[PDB]
Amino acid sequence: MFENITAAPDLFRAKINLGIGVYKDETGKTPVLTSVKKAEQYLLENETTKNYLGIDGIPEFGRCTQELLFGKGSALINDKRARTAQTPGGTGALRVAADFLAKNTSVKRVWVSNPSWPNHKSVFNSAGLEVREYAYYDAENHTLDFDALINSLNEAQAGDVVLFHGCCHNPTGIDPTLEQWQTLAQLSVEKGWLPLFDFAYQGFARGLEEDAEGLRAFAAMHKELIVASSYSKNFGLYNERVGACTLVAADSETVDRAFSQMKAAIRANYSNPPAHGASVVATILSNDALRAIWEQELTDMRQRIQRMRQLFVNTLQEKGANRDFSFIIKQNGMFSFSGLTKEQVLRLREEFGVYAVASGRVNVAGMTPDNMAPLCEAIVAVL
Amino acid sequence: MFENITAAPDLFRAKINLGIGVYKDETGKTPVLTSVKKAEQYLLENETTKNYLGIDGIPEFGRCTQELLFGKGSALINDKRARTAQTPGGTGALRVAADFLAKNTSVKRVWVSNPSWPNHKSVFNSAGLEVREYAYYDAENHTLDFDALINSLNEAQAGDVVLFHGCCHNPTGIDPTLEQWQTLAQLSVEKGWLPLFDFAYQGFARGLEEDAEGLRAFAAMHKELIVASSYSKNFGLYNERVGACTLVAADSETVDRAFSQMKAAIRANYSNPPAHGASVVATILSNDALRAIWEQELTDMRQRIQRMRQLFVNTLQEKGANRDFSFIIKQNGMFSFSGLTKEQVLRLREEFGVYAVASGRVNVAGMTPDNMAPLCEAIVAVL
Ligand SMILES: Cc1ncc(COP(=O)(O)O)c(CNc2csc(C(=O)O)c2)c1O
Ligand SMILES: Cc1ncc(COP(=O)(O)O)c(CNc2csc(C(=O)O)c2)c1O
């Protein structure tokens, strides 16, 4: 049966890693957040069973998630228009959304930005959905090519899904402004798209509430949407697989009926979700003391990334780059395109032991005050 | 988009629950195992990051899993013929297997026993695979209808998958004898079936090694097979979602190549698996002291279930059932068909507040010395 299967399509370990996918602090570590350790201690002391969660996971996790996404006192919440399933990570949330859509709706196509996270195409294609790309990146001004975006999306038909990164666009760090979000929300209504928000970085651009502005602009305009959120980066809970799939419909009857089929899609996949990480998130979010400690830890990460963006631009200037890199200061989250070509990136790896992805994306959190000068000297050397 | 979706296809809470799905101790609780609490304390003290696991999860978890399944010193292990991905539960392992098979092989059909766990059909159908049933249960002798099983499976074509419960058949508690396993292994080779072992209860029939005899009889005969295993019941880790998908092929080159596609199927689903539960399992299995405590806890559960099987039969006789229920003593694991009809089960619920599933399956671990007499009086009343 397996003898003819084709293979599916480390060098760092065998120097600086900007190709990493996680947050690193100023010492180059990805420690467990203190709020998380405190919550894990509480769970160790107080859990009396590991009995299965319901298919949609811990109720308090769902409530806290909806408040994060929509705001406390949101009409969507008041009107019981949203249902949330706790999932194994943002990836699990995307796949539950894709399976739900493939099996229960006429959706055949999802629109994703060019560029995006490479796994988007894999997830949607796995559920039998085609993926189409829309223009996004103005590589000259290192900005959002808004006109190109809108012209691309004119090819999207009514009933197609359009995926939006909520904030901290991966890989570019370029997000729509609030006005641009509002223009897109209007356009999406007019064109009949189903918005799919992928929100893996809430809190890493400007703040928890600010980073949800775009989603909230869409939620104010649409009867229906889906949000796939992740707590991997903003709680440092990567390996515990903590995300959420939130379904929004016109009213409570409709969302409950549709959500029954979302739960059926989960039941046929992994049955019910992993408790430990989501219980940590619910414990923290629902406790004033822990939430305050967590919110400050997240602010500390957001700010450290900002300081590295500024230090990177300043240090490149000091090392004689003689090029405008100011765009980096304005970009949001851990990732930016450096503007280096695939061959400069290869050179960077081979001649200097500095590792980025081939697109020239760098993880600004791999940068530290200690590694910044050698890193920038290397970049200057390949310009 | 959602306005026309059909709904997917508590009374207990609103008396005795034999329709429960988990182990209960003699006090009616499903506590966290002591070995698990000790491992969780160790992890709280020693974990320094939540950085993502690889797609296939914690290496030590994979090694310990293969030793459990195949035996230490197994030729499959020595010859590097097996690769294991840690998954979110046995259900996750079944779905990864189904997605792997649907996308990378010519499999179109999976054969499942009539009866089985109801979610088998949901999982395989979700991956686009048809499910066919084979005969299993001799409702007169309350035994394995082996002739019917073999005659049913004669309809299976070469290249179909046949699913076997490794031990503690759910819902019947009726397992093949070793000789019957050996006959099935031979037949499977001759007919070209791909065996899929579902092993959710290792340790609950006679013991860890004994309960793997049937799988090992198949592994001795086949170049290829897949095992979907779960640690939910044998570690009491239900909600942490701890299982494994083990792929076996003729040699190391072939299994590595095929497993690359299994990892691609995982990447497009939930990316990488939840650490906490599998880390508990790896910590326990790899430590002589913790493993000894765990093995005794599992023995305690296995034995308590045996004592309830014996107490149930004795108590039914004492309460005037006047029917042979001796078959219960011989059956394996938490589940047995009581032999009650769907209407007797309904009556049991409505008139007596005793809850079983409509098939008459009962969870023997919902039985305790304290609840046994009323439960049996109720059953006698509906006979
Ligand atoms: C836009 C977007 N969508 C989905 C995901 C998946 O998040 P988790 O499944 O890890 O929670 C992520 C984060 N997953 C991820 C891990 S490394 C990485 C990268 O781009 O390096 C990305 C994301 O940035
Ligand atoms: C034969 C078989 N296959 C797969 C599974 C799934 O196990 P987990 O996904 O819970 O690890 C299980 C256990 N899942 C389960 C939870 S309640 C239940 C039942 O039959 O009541 C079954 C099983 O018995």
- Residue A83's H or E segment, with its range, is strand A82-87
Q: Which residues, including other chains, have CB under 8 Å from residue B329's CB and lie 6 or more apart?
A: B309, B310, B313
B104 vs A: CB within 8 A: yes
Q: Is A333 in the pocket of ligand 1 (CB under 6 A)?
A: no
| Distance (Å) of CA B264 to CA B75, B93, B268, B363 | 27, 14, 6, 37
Q: Is A339 annotated as a binding residue?
A: no
**B78/B82 Cα distance (integer angstroms):** 9
Q: What share of chain A is helix, strand, coil (3-state, %, to 5)?
A: 45, 15, 40
Q: How far apart are CA A248 and CA A224, in angstroms?
A: 5
Q: Which residues pair with A248 in a beta bridge?
A: A82, A225
Residue nearest ligand 1's atom 21 by CA: A21
Q: Which two tokens stand for residue A295?
A: 């919110």
d(CA B30, CA B22): 7
Closest by CA to B134, choosing from B143, B124, B122, B144, is B144
CA dist A367 and B139 (Å) reads: 68
On the question of a cis peptide bond just before residue B115, with omega within 30 degrees of 0, the verdict is: yes
Residue B229: C-alpha distances to residues A87, B58, B120, B182 (Å): 21, 15, 14, 21
Contact assessment for residue B168 and residue B331, using Cβ atoms and an 8 Å cutoff: no
- CB contacts of A247 in chain B (<8 Å) are 2
Q: Are the beta carbons of B83 and A2 closer than 8 angstroms?
A: no
Distance (Å) of CA B195 to CA B65, B215, B224, B246: 18, 9, 8, 12
Q: Do A241 and B271 touch (CB under 8 A)?
A: yes
The verdict on whether B117 is a catalytic residue reads yes
Between positions 225 and 284 of B, the ones with CB within 8 A of A are: 232, 236-241, 247, 249-250, 254-255, 257-258, 260-261, 263-265, 267-277
Instruction: Give which of B65, B103, B78 is closest to B197, Cα–Cα.
Output: B65
Q: What are phi and psi of B137, to 5 degrees?
A: -100, 120
What 8-state DSSP symbol labels residue B325?
-
Task: Identify the nearest ligand to the CA of A121 by its number.
Answer: 1
State how far the Cα of A209 lies from the Cα of A207, in Å rounded to an integer: 6
Residue B332 falls in which region: left (phi positive, over 0), alpha (psi -120 to 50) or beta: beta
Alpha helices in A234-274 (DSSP H): 252-267
- With CA atoms as reference, report the closest residue to B156 among B109, B221, B100: B109
Helix B252-267 and helix B89-104: axis angle, to 10°? 110
CB contact under 8 A, B41 and A40: no
Whether A253 and A225 have beta carbons less than 8 Å apart is answered as no
How far, in Å, are A21, A84, A225, B25 from residue A267 at the CA level? 30, 15, 22, 27
Q: Establish whether residue A244 lines the binding site of ligand 1, counting it when its CB lies within 6 angstroms of any ligand atom.
A: no
Q: Out of B5, B91, B268, name the one closest to residue A126 (CB).
A: B268
Residues B313 and A260: their CA atoms lie apart, in Å, by 40
Instruction: Kindly list the distances between the CA atom of residue A138 and the CA atoms of A85, A132, A371, in Å, as whole numbers in the listed order.
Output: 36, 19, 29
> Is the Cα dihedral B58, B61, B66, B67 positive or negative?
positive
Atom of ligand 1 nearest to the CA of A363: 21
Tell me how many degrees the CA angle B297-B299-B303 measures, rounded to the nearest 5.
Answer: 120
C-beta contacts of B370-376 below 8 A and 24+ residues apart: B371/B16, B371/B28, B372/B308, B372/B311, B372/B312, B372/B315, B373/B315, B373/B319, B374/B16, B375/B16, B375/B18, B375/B315, B376/B312, B376/B315, B376/B316, B376/B318, B376/B319, B376/B321
Tokens at A182, concatenated:
């509002």
Alpha carbon distance B281, B40 (integer Å): 10
**Residue B224 in contact with residue A4, Cβ under 8 Å?**
no
Residues of chain A with a following break (C to N over 2.5 Å): 9, 14
Cβ–Cβ gap B274/A274 under 8 Å: yes
* Least CB–CB distance from A274: residue in B48, B88, B104: B88
Query: CB distance B269–A237 less than 8 Å?
Result: no
From B111, B117, B181, B193, the catalytic residue: B117
CB contact under 8 A, B88 and A50: no
**Helix, strand, or coil here: B132?**
strand
Q: Which amino acid is at A89?
A: G
In chain B, the residue whose alpha carbon lies closest to the alpha carbon of A160 is B1
Neighbours of A327 (CB within 10 A): 18
Token reading at A26: 């100023």
Kindly state the tokens that stand for B42.
């160790």
- Alpha-carbon distance of A104 to B31, in angstroms, equals 38
Which residues precede gaps in chain B, with C-N > 2.5 A? Answer: 9, 14
B87, β-bridge pairs: B243
| B233 a catalytic residue | yes
CA angle B122, A259, B11 (to 5 degrees): 75
Report the alpha-carbon distance of residue A6 to residue B142 in Å, rounded: 46
Q: Is A21 annotated as a binding residue?
A: yes
Assign residue B89 a region: left if phi > 0, alpha if psi is -120 to 50, beta otherwise?
Answer: left
Exposed e or buried b for every residue in B262-289, given b needs 16+ CB within 10 A?
bbbbbbbbbbbbbbbbbbbbbbbbebee
What angle separates helix B178-191 from helix B213-221, to the nearest 10 degrees? 30
Distance from CA of A249 to the nearest CA of B (A): 7
The residues near A11 (Cβ < 8 Å, ≥ 6 apart) are A349, A355
Q: What is the DSSP string of B243-301?
A: EEEEEE-SSHHHHHHHHHHHHHHHHTTTSS--HHHHHHHHHHHT-HHHHHHHHHHHHHH
CA–CA distances in Å: residue A48 to residues A59, B54, B324: 18, 30, 39
Q: What share of chain B is helix, strand, coil (3-state, %, to 5)?
A: 45, 15, 40
**Rounded Cα–Cα distance for residues B84 and B58 (Å):** 10
Half-sphere exposure of A328 (CA within 13 A, CB side): 29
| Residue A363 per-residue DSSP state | E
Contact A112, A132 (CB under 8 A): yes
β-strand partners of A237: none
For A300, the token pair is 């500390």
Cβ(A165) – ligand 1 distance below 6 Å:
yes
What tokens does B140 get?
A: 């007169």
Taking only residues 56 to 95 of chain A, the set having a beta carbon closer than 8 angstroms to any beta carbon of chain B reads 87-89, 91-92, 95
Helix (H, G, I), strand (E, B) or coil at B19: coil
CB proximity B34 to A under 8 Å: no
Q: Going by DSSP bridges, is the β-strand pair B143-144/B137-138 parallel, antiparallel, or unpaired? A: antiparallel
Query: Mind giving me the DSSP string for A179-209?
Result: HHHHHHHHHHHHHTPEEEEEES-TTSSS-HH
Asked if B238 and A125 come within 8 Å (Cβ–Cβ), the reply is no
In angstroms, the CA A43 to CA B246 distance is 31
| B365 SS3 class | helix
Maximum alpha-carbon separation in chain A: 62
- Distance of alpha carbon B318 from the chain centroid: 33
Measured between CB atoms, does B32 come within 8 Å of chain A? Answer: yes
If you ran DSSP here, which 8-state letter would residue A166 be given? S
**Residues in chain A closer than 8 A to B86 (CB atoms):** none
* Count of other CB atoms within 10 angstroms of residue A139: 11
User: Cα–Cα distance between B204 and B48 in angstroms, integer?
Assistant: 35
B114 in contact with A at a CB cutoff of 8 Å? no
CA B297/CA B136 separation, integer angstroms: 31
Shortest Cα–Cα distance, A87 to chain B (Å): 9
Nearest CA in chain B to A56: B239
Q: Give resolution, Å, one decimal.
A: 1.7
Residues 6+ apart with CB under 8 A from B249: A2, A3, B81, B223, B224, B255, B258
Beta bridge partners of B282: none
B172 lines ligand 2 (CB under 6 A): no
Go through the domains of chain B in sequence order and give each one's CATH number.
10-31+303-383 (3.90.1150.10), 32-302 (3.40.640.10)
Closest CB to A49: pick one of B30, B89, B273. B30
A111 pocket-lining for ligand 1 (C-beta < 6 Å): no
Q: What count of other Cβ atoms lies within 10 Å of the Cβ of residue A74? A: 17
Q: Strands A361-363, A82-87: parallel, antiparallel or unpaired by DSSP?
A: unpaired
Q: Could you give the angle at which helices A59-70 and A213-221 cross, rounded to 10 degrees?
A: 90
Residues with Cβ < 8 Å from B233, sequence gap 6 or more?
Answer: B22, B23, B200, B201, B204, B334
Ligand 1 mean position, distance from CA A97 (Å): 16
Which residues of A are the active-site residues?
A: 117, 198, 233
Cβ <8 Å between B268 and A238 = no
Residues 6+ apart with CB under 8 A from A108: A129, A130, A160
Q: Which residue has 């596609």 as its token pair? A: B261
Around Cβ A224, how many Cβ atoms within 10 Å?
Answer: 18
Nearest to A356 by CA among A31, A12, A9, A28: A12
- Ligand 2 atom nearest to CA at B169: 1
CA of A356 to the centre of ligand 2 (A): 43
Q: Which residues contact A73 (CB under 8 A, 6 or more apart)?
A: none
| Residue located nearest, by CA, to atom 23 of ligand 1 | A200
